[PDB]
């Protein structure tokens, strides 16, 4: 009758949530403050991550060059991603300077990227972005952050590099995709079932729509909340209703998405 | 057919960060999401962001219109404001162009006329030689300062009310544990329906916090719907539930 939970796993859950909602500045703050990182990377993969998140593109290029002559290592796409992020950062520095030499740096990055581009049309789009007073005036690059772009670059680079890590017993757990939202909705469903069972026993039998519209995510009616009543109730109960076929209704969620400040 | 707002989830995360005193992350999330856990007037929010962003003279100018009131302690407010200012000045001076010791001494003798007792100020004077109470985090200190000034300025700054927008306390933890218990209940119902022996300790040990990737659906709710109403009042032991929480390995760097 005892359960063990780790706060580091809860912080991994909220880190996965922040990443799923593109709150990458909050994610990096939470990582550097609590020390935890969602996942288990190599001792050198952490170095590569710190390089990518700090904008050390030349160091990233000299770091993976030992892996140049390989087999499935797509050096074309790797260098394309790195130099494209470098060029976009130089362009964001240039268009905000309005100059000096940032235009020279942007054009040098564009010439370095001139070869690794997958198509000439994408290179034309890049050289067209070079002219705009703000690269965010393009529909594709409209919502573009340096931090989110660096996180995406690292996510694309590790999937190609991984090239090892140390195996552990249970230190290699990540947080499954949308695990915190799933656990929150499952806890809300547990509250709904407990309310449906406490009301059905207490006389008034409402339709299942009542207990679903009575969902309160912010305030919880249960002060202690966990009474461990549903499990012990299922414990001593006839085993015939477990083989009772039921309806397969679908759970319809409508998420009021976040209005992030620009 | 339910309504879920990501703002409420972010309020739960904010409450969780405040419970563990991860205030740098809490402030970063507030700034990046535009979400604030709790009800505040348009003036209380302004005082809040002034205190959090480190604008002390602006706070003093903002609350000066309330110091003339009778039922107000204008001695402790300026005391704590100038104390936090002096501590932040001392901290920014302790960093390895220097003219900050002048500002440190000015902030010290700016609060000399506001300390409750003289021995407290005398001890404060000894801090210029160093770290004798180093749980002092600026973000945490600014949050504590905002709380200590809000528990006294709200009498004149009404809340314009109810507390229906606050993320409760530890509600994220409760909902996570309840989701784990829902997974335990569904694994029990699957076990005793497929011809498998099962007990209560094994389903409790079978808790996968980080993820048993049983997908989300209302199957248990429909099973409760299509189930007779004559067995919903049985006799079962109210067990002794305990949750041991392995606390955080908060590192030492700032």
């Amino acid at each position: 009758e005892t359960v063990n939970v780790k706060e580091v796993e809860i912080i991994k859950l909220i880190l996965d949530f922040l990443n799923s909602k593109k709150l990458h500045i909050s994610m990096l703050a939470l990582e550097k403050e609590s020390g935890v990182i969602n996942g288990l990377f190599s001792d050198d993969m952490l170095f590569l991550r710190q390089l990518i998140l700090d904008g050390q593109w030349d160091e990233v290029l000299q770091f993976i060059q030992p892996l140049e002559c390989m087999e499935k290592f797509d050096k074309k796409r790797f260098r394309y991603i790195i130099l494209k992020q470098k060029f976009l950062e130089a362009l964001c520095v240039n268009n905000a300077m309005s100059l000096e030499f940032t235009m020279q740096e942007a054009v040098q990055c564009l010439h370095a990227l001139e070869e690794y581009c997958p198509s000439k049309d994408d290179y034309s789009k890049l050289c067209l972005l070079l002219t705009l007073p703000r690269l965010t005036n393009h529909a594709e690059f409209k919502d573009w952050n340096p931090s989110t772009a660096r996180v995406h670059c690292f996510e694309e680079v590790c999937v190609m590099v991984a090239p090892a890590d140390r195996k552990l017993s249970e230190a290699g757990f990540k947080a499954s995709n949308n695990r915190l939202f799933q656990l929150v909705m499952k806890g809300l469903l547990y509250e709904c079932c407990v309310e449906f069972c406490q009301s059905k026993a207490t006389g008034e039998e409402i339709t299942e729509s009542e207990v679903l519209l009575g969902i309160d995510l912010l305030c919880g009616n249960g002060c202690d909340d966990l009474d461990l009543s549903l499990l012990s109730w299922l414990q001593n109960l006839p085993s015939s209703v477990f083989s009772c076929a039921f309806e397969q209704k679908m759970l319809n969620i409508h998420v009021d998405k976040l209005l992030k400040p620009t | 057919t339910v309504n879920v707002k990501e703002v409420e989830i972010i309020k739960l995360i904010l409450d969780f960060l405040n419970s563990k005193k991860l205030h740098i992350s809490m402030l970063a999330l507030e700034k990046e999401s535009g979400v604030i856990n709790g009800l505040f007037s348009d003036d209380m929010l302004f005082l809040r962001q002034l205190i959090l962003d480190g604008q002390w003279d602006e706070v003093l100018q903002f609350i000066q219109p309330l110091e003339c009131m009778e039922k107000f302690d204008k001695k402790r407010f300026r005391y704590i404001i100038l104390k936090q200012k002096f501590l932040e000045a001392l901290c920014v001076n302790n960093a390895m162009l220097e003219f900050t010791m002048q500002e440190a001494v000015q902030c010290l003798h700016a609060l000399e006329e506001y300390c409750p007792s003289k021995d407290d100020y005398s001890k404060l004077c000894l801090l210029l030689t160093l770290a004798e109470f180093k749980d002092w985090n600026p973000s945490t200190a600014r949050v504590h300062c905002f709380e200590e000034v809000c528990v006294m300025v709200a009498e004149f700054i009404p809340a314009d009310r109810e507390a229906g927008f606050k993320a409760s306390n530890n509600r994220l933890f409760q909902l996570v544990m309840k989701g784990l218990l829902y997974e335990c209940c569904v694994e029990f119902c699957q076990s005793k329906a497929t011809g498998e022996e099962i007990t209560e300790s094994e389903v409790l040990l079978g808790i996968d916090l980080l993820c048993g990737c049983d997908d989300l659906d209302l199957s248990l709710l429909s099973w409760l719907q299509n189930l007779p109403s004559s067995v919903f009042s049985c006799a079962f032991e109210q067990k002794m539930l305990n949750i041991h929480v392995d606390k955080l390995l908060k590192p030492t760097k700032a």
């Binding site: 069972c197 406490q198 009616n221 249960g222 002060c223 009543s229 109730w233 | 032991e237 109210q238």
Partner: peptide
Amino acid sequence: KMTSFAERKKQLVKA
């Protein structure tokens, strides 16, 4: 120790 379910609602209401 104790056996009740319909009493759990009343015990929660008594608060």
